Amino acid sequence: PYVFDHTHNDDWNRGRYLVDELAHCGECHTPRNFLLAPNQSAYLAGADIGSWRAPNITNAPQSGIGSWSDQDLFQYLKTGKTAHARAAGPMAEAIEHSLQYLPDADISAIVTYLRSVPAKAESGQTVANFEHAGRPSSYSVANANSRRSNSTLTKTTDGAALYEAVCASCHQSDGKGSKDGYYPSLVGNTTTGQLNPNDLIASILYGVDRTTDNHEILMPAFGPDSLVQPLTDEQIATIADYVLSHFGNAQATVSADAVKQVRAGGKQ
Amino acid sequence: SNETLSADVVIIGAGICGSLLAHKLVRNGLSVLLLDAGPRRDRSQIVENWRNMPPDNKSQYDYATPYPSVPWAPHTNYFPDNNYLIVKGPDRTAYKQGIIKGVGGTTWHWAASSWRYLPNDFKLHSTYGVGRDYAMSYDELEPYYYEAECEMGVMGPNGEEITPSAPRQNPWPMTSMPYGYGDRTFTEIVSKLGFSNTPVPQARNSRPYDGRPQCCGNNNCMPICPIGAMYNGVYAAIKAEKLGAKIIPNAVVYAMETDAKNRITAISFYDPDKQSHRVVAKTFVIAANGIETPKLLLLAANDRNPHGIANSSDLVGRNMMDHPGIGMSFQSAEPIWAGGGSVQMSSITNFRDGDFRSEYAATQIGYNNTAQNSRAGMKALSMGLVGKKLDEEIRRRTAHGVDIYANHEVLPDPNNRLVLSKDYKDALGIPHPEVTYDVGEYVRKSAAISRQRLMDIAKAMGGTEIEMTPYFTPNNHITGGTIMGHDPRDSVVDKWLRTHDHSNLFLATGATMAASGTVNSTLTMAALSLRAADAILNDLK
Amino acid sequence: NRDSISDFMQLSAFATGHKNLDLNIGSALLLAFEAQKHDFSTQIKALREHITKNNYQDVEALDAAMKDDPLHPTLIQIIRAWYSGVIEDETNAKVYAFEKALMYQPSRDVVVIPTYAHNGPNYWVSEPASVDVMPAF
Ligand SMILES: Cc1cc2nc3c(=O)[nH]c(=O)nc-3n(C[C@H](O)[C@H](O)[C@H](O)COP(=O)(O)OP(=O)(O)OC[C@H]3O[C@@H](n4cnc5c(N)ncnc54)[C@H](O)[C@@H]3O)c2cc1C
Numbered sequence: 001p002y003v004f005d006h007t008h009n010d011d012w013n014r015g016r017y018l019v020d021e022l023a024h025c026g027e028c029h030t031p032r033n034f035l036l037a038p039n040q041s042a043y044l045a046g047a048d049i050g051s052w053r054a055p056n057i058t059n060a061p062q063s064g065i066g067s068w069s070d071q072d073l074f075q076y077l078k079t080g081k082t083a084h085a086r087a088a089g090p091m092a093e094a095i096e097h098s099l100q101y102l103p104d105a106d107i108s109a110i111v112t113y114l115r116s117v118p119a120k121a122e123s124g125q126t127v128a129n130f131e132h133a134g135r136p137s138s139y140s141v142a143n144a145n146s147r148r149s150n151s152t153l154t155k156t157t158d159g160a161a162l163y164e165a166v167c168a169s170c171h172q173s174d175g176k177g178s179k180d181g182y183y184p185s186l187v188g189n190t191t192t193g194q195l196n197p198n199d200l201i202a203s204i205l206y207g208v209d210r211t212t213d214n215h216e217i218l219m220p221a222f223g224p225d226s227l228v229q230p231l232t233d234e235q236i237a238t239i240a241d242y243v244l245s246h247f248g249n250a251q252a253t254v255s256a257d258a259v260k261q262v263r264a265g266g267k268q
Numbered sequence: 269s270n271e272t273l274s275a276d277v278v279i280i281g282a283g284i285c286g287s288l289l290a291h292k293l294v295r296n297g298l299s300v301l302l303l304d305a306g307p308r309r310d311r312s313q314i315v316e317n318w319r320n321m322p323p324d325n326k327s328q329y330d331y332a333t334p335y336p337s338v339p340w341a342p343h344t345n346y347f348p349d350n351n352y353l354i355v356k357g358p359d360r361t362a363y364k365q366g367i368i369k370g371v372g373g374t375t376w377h378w379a380a381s382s383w384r385y386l387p388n389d390f391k392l393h394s395t396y397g398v399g400r401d402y403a404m405s406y407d408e409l410e411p412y413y414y415e416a417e418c419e420m421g422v423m424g425p426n427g428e429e430i431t432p433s434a435p436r437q438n439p440w441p442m443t444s445m446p447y448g449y450g451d452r453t454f455t456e457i458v459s460k461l462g463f464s465n466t467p468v469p470q471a472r473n474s475r476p477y478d479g480r481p482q483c484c485g486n487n488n489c490m491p492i493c494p495i496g497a498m499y500n501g502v503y504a505a506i507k508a509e510k511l512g513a514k515i516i517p518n519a520v521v522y523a524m525e526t527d528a529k530n531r532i533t534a535i536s537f538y539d540p541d542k543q544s545h546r547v548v549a550k551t552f553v554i555a556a557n558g559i560e561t562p563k564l565l566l567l568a569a570n571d572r573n574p575h576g577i578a579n580s581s582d583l584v585g586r587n588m589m590d591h592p593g594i595g596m597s598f599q600s601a602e603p604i605w606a607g608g609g610s611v612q613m614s615s616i617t618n619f620r621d622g623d624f625r626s627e628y629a630a631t632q633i634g635y636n637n638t639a640q641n642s643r644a645g646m647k648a649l650s651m652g653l654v655g656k657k658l659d660e661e662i663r664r665r666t667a668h669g670v671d672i673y674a675n676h677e678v679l680p681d682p683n684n685r686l687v688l689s690k691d692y693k694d695a696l697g698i699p700h701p702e703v704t705y706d707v708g709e710y711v712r713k714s715a716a717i718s719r720q721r722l723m724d725i726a727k728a729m730g731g732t733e734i735e736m737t738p739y740f741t742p743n744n745h746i747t748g749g750t751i752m753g754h755d756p757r758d759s760v761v762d763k764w765l766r767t768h769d770h771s772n773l774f775l776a777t778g779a780t781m782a783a784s785g786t787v788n789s790t791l792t793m794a795a796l797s798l799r800a801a802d803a804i805l806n807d808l809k
Numbered sequence: 810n811r812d813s814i815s816d817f818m819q820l821s822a823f824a825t826g827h828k829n830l831d832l833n834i835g836s837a838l839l840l841a842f843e844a845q846k847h848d849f850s851t852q853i854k855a856l857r858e859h860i861t862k863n864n865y866q867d868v869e870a871l872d873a874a875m876k877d878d879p880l881h882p883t884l885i886q887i888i889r890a891w892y893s894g895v896i897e898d899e900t901n902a903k904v905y906a907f908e909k910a911l912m913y914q915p916s917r918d919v920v921v922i923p924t925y926a927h928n929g930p931n932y933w934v935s936e937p938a939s940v941d942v943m944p945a946f
């Protein structure tokens with residue numbers, strides 16, 4: 001049974017009940033302390049769940065969601081879609097199964113409680129995950145002319161070329177997405193802006209699949225099991241490196257080994 | 269080359285037909301060896317190749333240059349005519365068909381117009397006295413039509429009534445996505461002419477389907493979708509390989525061996541280095557398309573089968589069929605803004621059936637929704653304009669440029685024949701295919717009215733610079749070369765696509781189709797391949 | 810080496826009428842032009858000198874006055890290279906620009922550049938803009 005902390009209003013207590021007991025955000029947003037128990041030292045400070053990573057959602061202005069606007073947090077929790085963040089994987093499943101059916105008051109209470117979570121900053125954090133500006137594209141159309149009369153992407157090792165061929169239709173060559181926002185901007189995106197590129201790699205490996213209000217939004221998978229365009233670990237690492245260096249956190253790096261580990265369900 | 273590469277079923281050709289058949293067979297516990305003469309192709313590399321294709325090759329419809337042609341298994345290229353498919357006869361231009369060799373085949377660059385044939389199309393001779401009847405009825409192919417539609421993710425006009433249209437037992441898996449501006453405008457314009465412009469059923473995602481994205485109107489279905497929002501035959505190959513099917517690219521089948529009962533015992537294929545490998549199987553299927561299936565059958569002629577494999581009726585390579593097209597290009601008086609949505613979104617289906625089919629061919633008239641920006645840019649640049657005039661001309665010609673087509677049904681003619689070329693060979697020494705084509709008085713009488721209808725459409729749109737092709741154009745649906753039927757003396761395969769001569773050999777191709785129909789034929793080929801899969805499963809289990 | 814690309818870029822901005830031109834595309838086009846024609850830099854200088862001496866205000870006046878001048882073909886070729894993205898008229902011609910080629914810009918607000926999404930999946934339900942309103946680029 002939930003205990004009502006009388007030093008806070010009813011909205012805060014309801015939000016705490018929803019976060020801790022009902023929607024159990026800490027069940028995958030709070031790191032387990034290697035005893036398979038939540039670490040009370042780092043509550044809602046980010047954790048690894050399989051191939052995905054639930055980021056820091058404390059009130060840290062840079063490491064967490066402290067700099068998120070209340071409107072953006074509400075919209076993300078209700079629909080999973082925001083100009084700076086899109087829910088994918090476990091977050092998409094959590095939103096489309098539990099959160100999308102929550103009342104507006106309940107999501108507002110969750111936001112109110114989240115704004116009071118003590119901040120858990122990170123070592124390499126100076127700007128927020130959605131505050132990485134874009135760099136101009138380095139793709140060359142002319143340099144692709146030598147790769148004509150090729151039937152496969154094997155000899156396409158350039159990161160810009162790979163991003164343009166596999167990825168620049170929906171997201172644009174500048175990485176700013178579509179005008180209507182259906183294709184998210186990779187610039188200013190929380191997934192590409194994280195210092196931990198896990199969620200980026202997973203996003204490439206499995207795509208995105210979120211059904212909100214009976215409307216389905218899908219990024220196709222690009223891993224070995226892809227139907228649209230299978231990509232090797234090296235190719236995914238190169239595309240992720242280009243995305244990070246041009247549209248996202250430039251202090252984050254992706255190696256083929258990292259993509260391989262993400263493919264294997266992360267650390268065991 | 270020493271290994272004999274055994275399997276339960278070996279399927280020659282990894283296009284839509286072969287890959288769908290392989291996927292259905294491995295799903296049911298059969299060992300499958302899928303051979304393709306072409307190489308493995310990556311969608312993104314083809315996208316890059318098309319993007320770096322010259323704009324003149326985009327303006328005119330170059331659908332082969334993005335796919336590099338391999339010397340051991342060349343496919344057709346027409347901007348520089350590579351002279352692979354030789355065409356003769358008065359209507360040679362109408363059989364300059366486009367094919368793509370590789371895992372996924374020509375469905376790599378099709379428009380994904382997935383059409384069901386009318387019930388009368390299967391009984392054309394019994395209904396109108398022309399052409400030939402299919403060995404099976406529409407009701408027999410309906411479940412396989414639906415299975416193909418569900419696997420390929422076809423979207424169709426679910427809630428609408430189209431008077432000539434195949435009766436469906438189930439709705440389309442997806443509903444047709446809304447028209448772009450060009451299709452709405454064309455529908456409204458031609459409704460006043462008595463023409464019913466209706467949505468084309470498309471293997472395209474109007475919603476996220478099969479783990480693939482919803483169509484965002486890249487308007488490049490021909491020749492490559494960058495995001496896989498439409499169905500490509502490579503999907504079935506990938507799914508089959510995931511389920512255990514063995515795919516061998518660059519495997520050019522050239523020889524076939526038969527026993528005393530004329531059953532196929534083995535096949536022999538070449539690698540790009542012309543090393544021979546002998547595959548042995550319990551069941552052999554050729555799904556190599558309507559040009560390469562008869563070409564292989566004629567090339568694999570044995571002592572038991574001197575005129576070609578499964579050619580006891582001398583009909584292999586005969587009755588070659590397609591939809592002879594007449595193209596018109598003009599500048600609409602009012603903006604049409606082609607490019608919203610897929611390249612083919614709607615067509616006039618009013619003339620798909622009628623009593624007139626006893627006299628002249630039934631036709632499909634359609635509007636091309638491909639974006640006209642490359643065409644407009646090249647034309648304005650060739651006009652010698654500079655500055656603001658050049659920009660205004662480009663904008664006006666991309667807003668007003670209209671491409672219209674009228675395709676016709678051709679009857680199966682034994683003299684419309686594919687043979688092995690006596691003058692041209694590829695890098696492996698295999699003779700090139702040579703097709704002699706004549707559309708016939710049926711198509712000519714139909715075209716006398718189709719040209720008038722196209723001119724009426726252009727007049728209703730206030731068209732200027734009207735350019736109608738003075739010849740018949742190919743529409744890339746190759747059928748009839750391995751015709752089906754009930755009489756072994758007048759057909760090659762039976763109602764189950766099994767050859768009359770060889771109880772062991774199945775031919776999962778459009779070449780088995782006895783009538784070309786009025787609309788695109790690949791969905792019927794896929795349904796026939798699934799039906800042949802049922803027959804093979806009955807044989808081997 | 811740097812004056813040649815600056816001169817080519819300024820002459821290209823004059824000839825196309827559009828100031829915002831990609832520098833990398835311009836460098837590639839200049840290299841291709843100098844491979845095709847060894848005197849191309851001399852012709853660029855001659856065109857620039859003709860523009861500065863007669864004080865032509867736009868490419869329209871220059872093209873009108875250059876009708877019989879032997880330097881006119883190079884002006885038209887430069888405009889074609891920037892608008893179509895190619896210099897030669899073959900099938901194997903190198904494409905130096907797609908989606909940034911200037912001939913796709915007059916209709917970008919309405920017509921999709923094919924392999925790049927205009928916007929999300931069902932945008933075409935909207936009504937197109939007027940033909941008489943030229944997008945700025
Ligand atoms: C531009 C274009 C647009 C089209 N649009 C439509 C459309 O909108 N709707 C529609 O219904 N149809 C359309 N089509 C037609 C469609 O592409 C074909 O009907 C379809 O691909 C069926 O071909 P298939 O599966 O029989 O064989 P294909 O896929 O053509 O070829 C199968 C495979 O056989 C292999 N092969 C050939 N010879 C050998 C050999 N000797 N040994 C081994 N392997 C071999 C090839 O390498 C190839 O990969 C279009 C075609 C083109 C060119």
Ligand code: HEC
Nearest residue numbers: 023024025028052053054055057087088090091094190199
């Ligand atoms: C495990 C199934 C989760 C539960 C329960 C909750 N979240 Fe989550 N969240 C999870 C993942 C794997 C991700 C990453 C998404 C991506 O595409 O990589 C997220 C994301 C968020 C975010 C966005 C943070 C950012 O991207 O920087 C927020 C604000 C967030 N999650 C909050 C949140 C809340 C409030 C939850 C309780 C209702 C909650 N999450 C549950 C995994 C899981």
Ligand code: HEC
Nearest residue numbers: 085086088166167170182183191203208217218219481495
């Ligand atoms: C169109 C079919 C796409 C292609 C090709 C690529 N992406 Fe994508 N991506 C697409 C959608 C529709 C979405 C999100 C759904 C939404 O809620 O609207 C995404 C998502 C991403 C993300 C995550 C964004 C977030 O979680 O905040 C990333 C990092 C991403 N996409 C990257 C990416 C890359 C690197 C691609 C090239 C391989 C690529 N995408 C292709 C649509 C499409």
Ligand code: F3S
Nearest residue numbers: 485486487488489493
């Ligand atoms: S190119 Fe692809 S995105 Fe749609 S318009 Fe054709 S299926």
